[PDB]
């Protein structure tokens, strides 16, 4: 199909920066396959030398060629594997980096609609399957497809009728292997489906453990798990029975060709045409040819699964984002005025925001309140240029916020979410996050200004101590303190605070309502109570998405 | 218990190997007969022996495999069921990988032993090559294998760490876009990728070295026996047909030993990972009438996390029938602990308690769980259907008319009928099918359907809606048959406590107030503080 062709072309284009490793591995592959094909013919030569009159020169020459070709085939096969696994790792690393880089720049709604496990499966497990196509599967297919033809050259070189026997024998083996592989794949699909069902059963049982223990329903869940396990065991038994039956019929057909081939070869022996070493070499070649055919068929079967995985991964990097290019505006001086005008926002999945219009000032502390189904955070989300407004526009200094520089806007307009999130690094990294390189003195200056130094100075190396993953080592008060310190350390002009009186102490509110970077900077505070009404210079309200 | 079939499987494997051994010996002796110019009777007999012996081998192998299966699967299922039952009061991949590797190891070990045995049947001198080169075949590849495995597992662990970091950034994406730090995450990913690239060169070197060592050892042996056998055939003590047998014997033995080296570390890893799982593995009176009443006498309890420190003490409340008890105050008083003790979740740390004239362990576990059913701290709905979710833990399945009556009593019948297909609608897991008030109504219906002797429903209407709380209070106040079964209201809504016949309150692990609600308000204790609040 055309899609498979362009997918394999893209895979080759991805593998292009590793051409020297590819040609070296291919050369070593040919050098290995030549000696591996050549050795049993010389073994038959040794046997033929021993059968007749004793020739020390011929025996010494044959043994020397044994030693040379043995060392050559042992050495040339090892280097090919190392080169191919190095190519595998290079392809895997390159595709991982490219996939992550293309995933970073996509819009927020794409991550909103897509579960994390769906991205994790593509990034972790499938990126392994990127590098299985050319370094491993194409190599094995090529080596099988060259060694089969070499072995068929040799057998013809031995005697033609014995090769016609093999030609007649092969298609049944090919058909049997195809049928067995298809059935095995189907049963494996059923196996993983049943395993997923059992995992869902045990997850449901362990999720409501307190409820089950209170109601005393552990026996029922145990019985359900036993039923699922019985289904899984029955499926496993079916799979293994099918595999054993395939092996039995394969060995039966193996003798069904072997005995008759031996009979015809011995008839040719008694006719005086062939010798003992030639027959032995033919026997070795026959033993190898069938196995090579089956492994070739299995690898060509794996080809399609790898190509499908390639399409699945490339669908992500081919997903076009829907965000306009920045206008690269970055004024040296910013007054900081923010004006809303008849704006409307619609979620990708419903007028959540409609007809909002206001204007903020640098020295004026503005507060927005109103439950409206806890959708008040969408105003800050729209202000941070995280979402594109469906109607109207948002303007800073009579300039649309889209035209501003992406780095400068987020280094100028800083907000803090309801739930602060940490990045599992040091406090030095997690406070100056978003900054390439700045002085530490400002970092603990802002930490002291945010009432967060209490648990910093008590911890070793100050800001260089390590916190838990996702910040889970610390508590919610530490989350709010770290978020405020991060917001203050970047020195913003438009500062947004959410749930200041709903999830944070008034000391943080007092610090953020009297700071030097908060005295004359544009501040928008959102609270779930009237604690901010008494101190707000201007207060605005909204309900059901409208003023 | 399965040895009665495992011994049969083992002897089946041995006989299958003996039967399979028929190809090379007979073809070598048959070519020697060709050189001997004998009569065709020997040739025909040898061909018949060939076919019969190996077809018996194939059938015996299939039977032995089918006997090993249907038994190892049963053992795996029983083990997983026992583990799940133990953890109730991650493994299947380990189990079936261990089974597969163990059976492969046994098969190829018996095959190699049979190979060596029939080598010793033939000329002893050609066997000596194998018996001196076997330690070189075993020791050195085992040395390289652990190095290669260590490098591979290091690479896999680093890959897992990098993927974890990337998925953490992907989950935290809104904050990243807020701070505009995509390039920082890109650099953080790139550094770990660079470390992986650094390790992978050593990994590839180890892989190449291991392949070199294995191939050179095996096929050096293959050329060594050929040279020695040629020398001995020149000496004349060994026929050429025996050499023809020995060549194929060496190929089969090399394949078997290489399978053994490739398999054994997997078996060791499997048993090492299974030992920790094996470590992780580790009667009452039945009432036949109404319970009537339950009481405690200054009972004390302790938390399982710190059993040396008591949680609360001084439990003197009595579940008087036809009356509603009350409990409110600080959460540190052990009210949840008292509710758990009333549900016989754990034995008391002190004092005494009784239920229908007997202690809680004295009554049967099924009867106690069926007659003392209570609503949880937060309502939870299982992933089954609503008709199945409202009857969890029932010893016998009752009629759907009773379920409809219970839903109507709890007011959830209309909500169930709002869903398609009535009460038989499939409910999403973790209460995602409907709202929290609907979940609380479902929990109340499930409690009512069991027809409890002492309802301990609490923490349901406090976290539910105001309308749901009003409906729950109205249902509690409208209990028929002189309130029938008693209740223990431990909800946060003190308004419903006005109907309590013998109210009570606890604070700091002990009781602090009791009596009438008006008397509690007129007091000066914790109830008076709540009234003044």
């Amino acid at each position: 199909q055309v899609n498979n062709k362009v997918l394999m072309w893209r895979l080759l284009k991805l593998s292009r920066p590793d051409l020297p490793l590819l040609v070296a591995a291919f050369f070593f592959l040919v050098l290995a396959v030549l000696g591996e094909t050549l050795i049993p013919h010389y073994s038959g030569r040794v046997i033929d030398i021993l059968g007749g009159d004793f020739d020390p020169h011929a025996f010494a020459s044959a043994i020397f060629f044994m030693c040379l070709f043995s060392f050559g085939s042992s050495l040339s096969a090892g280097c090919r594997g190392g080169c191919f696994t190095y190519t595998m790792s290079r392809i895997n690393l390159r595709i991982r980096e490219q996939l992550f880089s293309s995933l970073l720049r996509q819009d927020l709604g794409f991550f909103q609609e897509t579960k994390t496990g769906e991205l994790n499966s593509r990034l972790s497990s499938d990126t392994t399957l990127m590098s299985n196509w050319l370094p491993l599967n194409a190599n094995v297919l090529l080596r099988s497809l060259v060694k089969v033809v070499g072995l068929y050259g040799f057998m013809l070189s031995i005697s033609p009728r014995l090769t016609l026997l093999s030609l007649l024998h092969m298609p049944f083996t090919i058909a049997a292997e195809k049928v067995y592989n298809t059935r095995h794949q189907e049963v494996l699909r059923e196996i993983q489906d049943a395993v997923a069902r059992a995992g869902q059963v045990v997850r449901e049982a362990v999720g409501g453990l307190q409820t089950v223990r209170s109601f005393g329903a552990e026996e029922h869940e145990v019985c359900r798990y036993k039923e699922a396990l019985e289904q899984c065991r029955q499926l496993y038994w079916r799979r293994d029975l099918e595999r054993a039956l395939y092996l039995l019929v394969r060995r039966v057909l193996h003798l069904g060709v072997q005995m008759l081939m031996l009979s015809c070869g011995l008839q040719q022996m008694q006719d005086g045409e062939l010798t003992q070493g030639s027959l032995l070499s033919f026997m070795i070649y026959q033993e190898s040819v069938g196995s090579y055919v089956q492994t070739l068929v299995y690898i060509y079967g794996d080809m399609l699964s790898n190509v499908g995985a390639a399409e699945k991964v490339f669908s992500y990097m081919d997903r076009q984002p829907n965000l306009p290019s920045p206008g690269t505006l970055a004024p040296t001086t910013l007054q900081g005025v923010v004006k809303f005008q008849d704006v409307s926002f619609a979620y990708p999945n419903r007028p959540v925001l409609k007809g909002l219009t206001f204007t903020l000032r640098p020295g004026e502390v503005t507060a927005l309140v109103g439950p409206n189904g806890s959708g008040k955070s969408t105003v800050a989300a729209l202000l941070q240029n995280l979402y594109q407004p469906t109607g109207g526009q948002v303007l800073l200094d009579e300039k649309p916020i889209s035209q501003y520089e992406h780095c400068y806007l987020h280094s100028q307009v800083v907000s803090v979410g309801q739930e602060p999130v940490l990045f599992s690094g040091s406090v030095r990294n997690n406070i100056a996050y978003g900054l390439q390189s700045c002085e530490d003195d400002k970092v603990m200056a802002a930490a002291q200004a945010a009432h967060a130094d209490d648990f910093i100075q008590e911890m070793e190396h100050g800001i260089y101590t390590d916190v838990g993953e996702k910040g889970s080592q610390l508590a919610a008060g530490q989350k709010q303190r770290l978020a405020i310190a991060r917001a203050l350390v970047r020195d913003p002009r438009v500062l947004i605070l959410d749930e200041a009186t709903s999830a944070l102490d008034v000391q943080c509110e007092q610090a953020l309502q009297d700071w030097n970077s908060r005295g004359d900077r544009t501040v928008l505070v959102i609270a779930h109570r009237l604690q901010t009404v008494q101190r707000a210079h201007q207060i605005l309200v909204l309900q059901e998405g409208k003023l | 218990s399965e040895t009665r079939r495992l011994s049969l499987f083992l002897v089946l494997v041995v006989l299958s190997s003996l039967g399979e051994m028929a190809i090379p010996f007979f073809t070598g002796r048959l070519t020697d007969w060709i050189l001997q110019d004998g009569s065709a009777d020997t040739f025909t007999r040898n061909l018949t022996l060939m076919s019969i012996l190996t077809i018996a081998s194939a059938v015996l192998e299939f039977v032995g495999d089918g006997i090993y299966n249907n038994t190892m699967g049963h053992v795996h299922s029983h083990l997983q069921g026992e583990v799940f039952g133990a953890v109730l009061r991650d493994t299947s991949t380990l189990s079936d990988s261990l089974s597969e590797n163990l059976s492969l190891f046994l098969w190829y070990l018996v095959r190699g032993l049979c190979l060596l045995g029939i080598m010793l049947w033939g000329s002893v001198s050609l066997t000596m090559v194998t018996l001196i080169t076997l330690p070189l075949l075993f020791l050195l590849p085992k040395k390289v294998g652990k190095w290669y495995q260590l490098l591979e597992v290091q690479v896999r662990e680093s890959l897992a760490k990098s993927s974890q970091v990337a998925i953490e950034a992907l989950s935290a994406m809104p904050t990243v876009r807020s701070f505009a730090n995509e390039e920082g995450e890109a650099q953080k990913f790139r550094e770990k990728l660079q470390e992986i690239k650094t390790l992978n060169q050593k990994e590839a070197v180890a892989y190449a070295v291991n392949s070199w060592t294995t191939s050179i050892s095996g096929m050096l042996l293959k050329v060594g026996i050929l040279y020695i056998g040629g020398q001995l055939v020149t000496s004349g003590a060994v026929s050429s047909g025996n050499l023809v047998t020995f060549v194929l014997y060496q190929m089969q033995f090399t394949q078997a030993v290489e399978v053994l080296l490739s398999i054994y570390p997997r078996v060791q890893k499997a048993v090492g990972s299974s030992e920790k799982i094996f470590e992780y593995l580790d009667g009452l009176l039945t009432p036949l009438h109404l319970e009537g009443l339950v009481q405690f006498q200054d009972v004390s309890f302790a938390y399982p996390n710190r059993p040396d420190v008591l949680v609360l003490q001084g439990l003197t409340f009595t579940l008087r029938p036809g009356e509603v008890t009350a409990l409110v105050g600080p959460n540190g008083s052990g009210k949840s602990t008292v509710a758990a003790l009333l549900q016989n979740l754990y034995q008391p740390t002190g004092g005494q308690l009784l239920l229908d004239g007997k202690p809680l362990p004295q009554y049967e576990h099924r009867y106690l769980h069926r007659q003392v059913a209570a609503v949880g701290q937060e309502p939870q709905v299982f992933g089954r259907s609503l008709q199945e979710n409202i009857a969890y833990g029932l010893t016998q399945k009752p009629t759907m008319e009773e379920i409809t009556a219970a839903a109507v009593k709890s007011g959830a019948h209309s909500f169930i009928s709002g869903l398609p297909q009535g009460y038989d609608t499939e409910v999403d897991e973790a209460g995602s099918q409907l709202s929290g008030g609907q979940r609380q109504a479902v929990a109340l219906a499930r409690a009512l359907i069991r027809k409890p002797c002492v309802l301990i429903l609490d923490d349901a209407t406090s976290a539910l809606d105001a309308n749901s709380q009003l409906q729950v209070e109205q249902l509690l106040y409208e209990s028929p048959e002189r309130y029938s079964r008693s209740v223990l209201l431990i909800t946060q809504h003190l308004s419903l406590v006005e109907q309590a016949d013998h109210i009570l309150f606890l604070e700091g692990g002990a009781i602090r107030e009791g009596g009438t609600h008006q008397q509690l308000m007129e007091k000066k204790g914790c109830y008076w503080a709540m009234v003044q609040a």
């Binding site: 090919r80 594997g81 191919f84 696994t85 595998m88 370094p135 491993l136 190599n139 094995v140 595999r243 054993a244 092996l247 492994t295 690898i299 | 192998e61 495999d65 059976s103 492969l104 098969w107 190829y108 892989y207 392949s211 399978v259 490739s262 398999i263």
Partner: peptide
Amino acid sequence: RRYQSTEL
């Protein structure tokens, strides 16, 4: 049963 696998 027989072991079978592919090498790089």
